[PDB]
Symmetry: C8
Subunit: 123 residues, 8 copies
């Protein structure tokens, strides 16, 4: 298959929401390939609407996955290294999937020289 | 368990509040699967609100947990690496769960050229950037 | 036990101050569980007052602990790795327990293009 | 293949869009070498424009790929290190390919001295910095 | 030693000033335990002031110490890792003990779009954020 | 050779563009040494023009090289470590060769205390 | 060689310009020791100026060198670690030798609350911070 | 010895300038101990003047030392790890000894949403 199909598009948004890579999703019988999906994302606004929201839901699923991957890692050097890579890749991806929710968080206390007021000169 | 059940949702909130992760909670007897929990959240504002409170409590619980994970790690190379991964994952998650409390903390002393005042020159716009 | 008790709350603030994880504190006979303590922290202002101050005192104790953990680490690969994890976890926690005291410290010398004045255009 | 051939350039764009890297594409039967592709880009705006679109698509493809590389890594020390390198290289490249989408994301809560307002003192210029 | 004893507090300050850590000091003959030292600090402003001066001196002492720890490390994998941990712990602590002297140092050359001026557009508030 | 030569300067800009270190370029028979090239870069504007552009083209070549070095790394500990060093060195260099294109990319959402407006006091 | 000798100072500048480090230069036949070079610099502005130019050239030379060190590293664990150290040391040094050219490069897209405008509230000073 | 002595203070500033840790300096026969030196640094301005300048000169010596430590490292795992620690400690220290010269260097291109102008609203 390679034609637009709302029922499969919906199907796509569903699996995505649960956390599964799009790669692992399109890899199902009767589903559009990855390239086609990205094509649809340019000729269907109704799709780009269900897709971004699906991506934020996917992120929320992945957030809970990282605890499991870490806590259930097999206590062998290479398996722990793999678990770390799986977690690190997810952490990095989460920030991009929902920057407001999963981006880095910093509080910067801004002060001036010697803890006094910030000194500015203007021309 | 597919239909929304407040009593079960309440239990989920209590377990999360204590520091347990969602996927682990969902493995307990009679719990809904994670996908179902997410569906419940989506359609029940009462659950969403209690879940948000549980997440705050969850973070405070995890903050204490990381000390235990580190201090009690089995002194074996792989076990220590696993403990480190568990702690690092929690540290990252805490900042997201409560950014105000658990985000990074930096004090930036801002000075200018040669440790004097910050020098700023303002000029008329030179391109149409408005 | 699971009822409010100022004498045990005080007891809590005490052990906390010396550096001991709350987890290790509530784990004593006759003490409220962790969950209960966090509950009290919502129905007692007199508590939230002794608790935040206890936390800052706890931080000061932990600050001295990291030197000991580092300096007295057993010189074996895994024990040193564990010591490093114990220290790193404490460093990260200290910044959250007292951000003013234990947060990161940076001095930023702000200059403009080529070391000249910072150039701004406004619209 | 030295002369600019649109049909071949179009194929290159499709292959890149799917996530394949340029040097790997150029090893396929009948493809120009990388230096030739760069020469084509330099002198053909039609190719440059389609190549820019292909790069955006390439990034979206790679974003999905990194999950697979990590999750499917052979649990051997060297193979995991290689998978990590492949993922790290892609992460770095993604931010450059589409900075808006794949750049780092930070929220900075800006406060002043002792958690109060940011204190700013302005003064007449003291040196000729204009 | 439970009661505040100035002579002992003074010795503590001298030992800290030389670079010794508090827990190590408290193991010396006739020293109070750390909890007692903290109690003394809490209730004696004279000790607090001298302790603050000792902390500044302590930092300067540690700054020199880190060179020795690194340079004299036994060239064994575990011993080098331990030396690294001792040095890293001190580096982190120094920045807190005297932020002005031992904090990170960065020069940020600030420029705007395409290396020109920083472009700023100001607009009326669009939401009630005051 | 050690005299100015536009045909060799051109030759230089060519090899550079394809990604090859200048070190590896001057190492060809009849070519000026590295030191001489840097000298020319001070007495020929026509050169400093072809050189900076050559450097940006070199960067674009190196960008594609890093994928190959990573993906084709021999799966042996030391070879992977070497591949990582080769890639890391290139990543660092790319940012300097074309900062606009290859520099770090950050989006900073700037907010004030507790997510409110940024609070400023002026004197 | 203790007395300032311009011919020797000139040679030092040429060698540094080519990428050689000072301590290595000072080991060559007839060279002054490093302490002497520093003394020459301190008291001879002509040498200081030529040395500053040599440092710029040195940096450009090292920038090319790091590619060679990485690419030619012997694929042995210790040799690769040493090559990494040599490259990392040079990267750090380059940024100091020519900050404009070799410093870190970042583009910061600055936005405000919820991706809208940066919200700024100005208020009268509330403490004597002037 | 433990009395103020300009000739030894000078002697101190000398060795410091060449790069040698103060610890390694005071460790010479007839020299004040470390603690005494820090005491002098509070009762002699003529000293605090020769000392800060000595520190900047010390930094310049250390800067050249790091190349040697890196390039001449013995190619054994632990020796390379030690060399790395020696270099890292020096790099960190250099930034504190002369922040203007040895601090981190960053160029920040500041732009607004989507590469447009930085958008500000004021109240």
């Amino acid at each position: 298959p390679s034609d637009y199909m709302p029922e499969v598009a919906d199907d796509i948004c569903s699996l995505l929401s649960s956390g599964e890579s799009l790669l692992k999703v399109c890899k199902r019988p009767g589903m559009p390939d990855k390239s086609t999906v990205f094509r649809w994302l340019a000729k269907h606004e109704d799709f780009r609407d269900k897709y971004a929201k699906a991506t934020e839901a996917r992120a929320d699923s992945i957030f809970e996955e990282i605890f499991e991957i870490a806590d259930n890692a097999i206590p062998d050097a290479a398996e722990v290294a793999k678990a770390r890579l799986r977690v690190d890749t997810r952490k990095w991806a989460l920030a991009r999937m929902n920057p407001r929710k999963y981006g880095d968080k910093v509080t910067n206390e801004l002060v001036g020289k010697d803890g006094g007021a910030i000194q500015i000169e203007t021309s």
